[PDB]
Amino acid sequence: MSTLEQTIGNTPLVKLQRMGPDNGSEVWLKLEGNNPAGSVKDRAALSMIVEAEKRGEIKPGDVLIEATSGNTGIALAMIAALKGYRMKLLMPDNMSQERRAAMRAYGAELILVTKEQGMEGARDLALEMANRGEGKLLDQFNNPDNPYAHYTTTGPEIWQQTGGRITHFVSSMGTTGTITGVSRFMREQSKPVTIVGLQPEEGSSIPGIRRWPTEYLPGIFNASLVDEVLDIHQRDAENTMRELAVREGIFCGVSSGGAVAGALRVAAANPDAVVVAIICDRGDRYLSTGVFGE
Amino acid sequence: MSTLEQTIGNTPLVKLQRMGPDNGSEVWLKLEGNNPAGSVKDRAALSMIVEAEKRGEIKPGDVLIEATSGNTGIALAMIAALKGYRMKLLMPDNMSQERRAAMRAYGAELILVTKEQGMEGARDLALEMANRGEGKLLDQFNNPDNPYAHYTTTGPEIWQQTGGRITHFVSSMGTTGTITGVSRFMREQSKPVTIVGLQPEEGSSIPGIRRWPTEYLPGIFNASLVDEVLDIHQRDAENTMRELAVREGIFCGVSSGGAVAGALRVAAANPDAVVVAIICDRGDRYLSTGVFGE
Numbered sequence: 001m002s003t004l005e006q007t008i009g010n011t012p013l014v015k016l017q018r019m020g021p022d023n024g025s026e027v028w029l030k031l032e033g034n035n036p037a038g039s040v041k042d043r044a045a046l047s048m049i050v051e052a053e054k055r056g057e058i059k060p061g062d063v064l065i066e067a068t069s070g071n072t073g074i075a076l077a078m079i080a081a082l083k084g085y086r087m088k089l090l091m092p093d094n095m096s097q098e099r100r101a102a103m104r105a106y107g108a109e110l111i112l113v114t115k116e117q118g119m120e121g122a123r124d125l126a127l128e129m130a131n132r133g134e135g136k137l138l139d140q141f142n143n144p145d146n147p148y149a150h151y152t153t154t155g156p157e158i159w160q161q162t163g164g165r166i167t168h169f170v171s172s173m174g175t176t177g178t179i180t181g182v183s184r185f186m187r188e189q190s191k192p193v194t195i196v197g198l199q200p201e202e203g204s205s206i207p208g209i210r211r212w213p214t215e216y217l218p219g220i221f222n223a224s225l226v227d228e229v230l231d232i233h234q235r236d237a238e239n240t241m242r243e244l245a246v247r248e249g250i251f252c253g254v255s256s257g258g259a260v261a262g263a264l265r266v267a268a269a270n271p272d273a274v275v276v277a278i279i280c281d282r283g284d285r286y287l288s289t290g291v292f293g294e
Numbered sequence: 295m296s297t298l299e300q301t302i303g304n305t306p307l308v309k310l311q312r313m314g315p316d317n318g319s320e321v322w323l324k325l326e327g328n329n330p331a332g333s334v335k336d337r338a339a340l341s342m343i344v345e346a347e348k349r350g351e352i353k354p355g356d357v358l359i360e361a362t363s364g365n366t367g368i369a370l371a372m373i374a375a376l377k378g379y380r381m382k383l384l385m386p387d388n389m390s391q392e393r394r395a396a397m398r399a400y401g402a403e404l405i406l407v408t409k410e411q412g413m414e415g416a417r418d419l420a421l422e423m424a425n426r427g428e429g430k431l432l433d434q435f436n437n438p439d440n441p442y443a444h445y446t447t448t449g450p451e452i453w454q455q456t457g458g459r460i461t462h463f464v465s466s467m468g469t470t471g472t473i474t475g476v477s478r479f480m481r482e483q484s485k486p487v488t489i490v491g492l493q494p495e496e497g498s499s500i501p502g503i504r505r506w507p508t509e510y511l512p513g514i515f516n517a518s519l520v521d522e523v524l525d526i527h528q529r530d531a532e533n534t535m536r537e538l539a540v541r542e543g544i545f546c547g548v549s550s551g552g553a554v555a556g557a558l559r560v561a562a563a564n565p566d567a568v569v570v571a572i573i574c575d576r577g578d579r580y581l582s583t584g585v586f587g588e
């Protein structure tokens with residue numbers, strides 16, 4: 001609103017009108033697709049770069065590097081274009097060509113590793129580049145500035161937007177930055193707020209959500225910040241995503257369908273609850289995957 | 295913000311930081327991609343349906359019909375899903391399959407005419423359906439509720455957001471609803487505001503912009519509301535669109551590149567001007583057309 005940076009965050013909070021249970025509960029959707037590049041990752045991407053600037057680490061013209069398997073690449077390509085950085089993105093070679101085009105449109109340089117090398121191989125290559133002087137690694141799974149975005153913006157906004165009436169917060173977990181930052185903020189309030197994390201069922205594939213083995217949970221994650229973990233079946237996430245568009249006019253991705261599937265279970269269980277769920281992204285980049293077909 | 299309806303409009307106004315001329319002028323971008331379905335057409339689509347409701351014409355469950363060649367179909371599919379209507383969209387058979395999928399995701403029914411039948415044939419078929427009792431035609435090129443959206447929302451917002459400092463308003467013209475409604479509002483202010491319409495050069499194809507022959511200007515259009523018309527070359531619109539993404543982090547469609555190309559000429563001509571240009575949509579639905587390639 002001065003510039004594009006000021007359009008990150010302060011996203012709408014809107015109520016489901018047709019899909020909730022009829023038990024007095026309310027389900028409110030935090031529309032992170034309203035961020036300029038269309039997903040929640042704009043918050044972490046902005047924060048990682050702004051805080052690095054504040055620490056004197058980077059200046060416009062410098063090279064930034066990240067390993068990405070999804071929306072973080074798009075968000076970082078956008079912030080780099082916005083703020084005047086050169087962005088290098090390492091990704092496994094099952095990233096869709098459409099998503100590669102989305103990142104390239106902002107001027108980012110993309111680098112492949114094989115699917116079998118994976119995200120681990122992508123991070124290792126990013127470290128090797130950083131050591132050669134080829135750029136600064138952001139490290140979204142380990143960088144505290146990811147959850148800090150949510151501690152300072154997402155959480156406070158949800159509290160204000162609900163007038164402190166929120167009883168439950170529901171987040172599909174990927175990096176865990178969202179749930180971790182929001183929980184940290186909510187824990188500071190006098191009122192108890194139940195923090196609900198979502199993961200896929202074993203064998204379910206839901207873009208953007210991870211079923212972390214206990215031993216390989218991200219560096220930024222703190223199990224004690226989460227009160228309950230619910231599992232989401234892939235088909236339930238996809239069906240709920242399709243239903244959101246047709247019944248509510250809310251056009252979002254698969255993990256957002258998962259978030260609402262989970263929030264509906266929380267709301268059904270707890271009469272008169274005020275449940276807030278993160279809608280992680282708009283549906284646009286999912287159409288070419290076929291997932292909006294019945 | 296109660297529901298999704300309240301997320302239509304009140305879009306950001308952000309300044310160009312790198313691409314303006316250095317003559318004291320300012321170029322401000324009104325980000326209509328922030329509307330829930332990603333374009334400026336959400337405003338007209340909402341208004342046509344809300345005003346019909348106010349007139350007692352339609353009630354949830356009723357069938358609405360529109361002939362569309364672009365974003366209006368997506369916007370109306372979304373509003374129909376939001377408000378509980380059954381939407382039927384008639385389009386020429388050069389509509390991209392991706393855009394058909396975008397409309398279908400909201401539950402709309404799509405109907406083809408041939409490219410040679412065109413929009414005229416699409417409107418004629420819509421009238422024939424309306425006469426058989428198969429739905430209510432919205433008629434975006436003739437419906438006053440299209441420009442009324444911009445008279446009551448877009449214009450007032452731009453005035454407030456600039457603190458009355460706007461000197462020029464720049465709009466890529468399609469239906470002409472945006473320029474017509476905003477001009478009507480601006481003309482009511484004591485301060486003069488120059489209204490700049492953009493059309494493609496003869497032989498240029500810019501999605502969403504029309505080069506209307508004088509005799510076939512839309513029903514809603516009033517030539518006296520426009521102070522100057524500038525022509526935009528297709529390549530200039532496309533180059534400026536690509537430049538916006540790379541230099542500003544603003545990822546928008548071809549007509550938005552055209553709007554900024556035009557605004558830059560207005561700003562260059564008029565030192566210390568405060569120029570506001572409409573950014574009509576986000577870039578997402580353009581990636582598959584190849585236009586973001588250099």
Ligand SMILES: *Cc1c(COP(=O)(O)O)cnc(C)c1O
Binds near residue numbers: 174
């Ligand atoms: C990042 C992302 C998530 C998870 O959010 P985190 O803060 O990383 O836990 C969920 N869905 C999508 C589509 C995402 O991009």
Ligand SMILES: *Cc1c(COP(=O)(O)O)cnc(C)c1O
Binds near residue numbers: 575
């Ligand atoms: C509708 C539209 C326009 C034109 O706006 P009008 O209010 O119809 O004149 C420009 N570009 C795109 C992409 C559009 O969808």
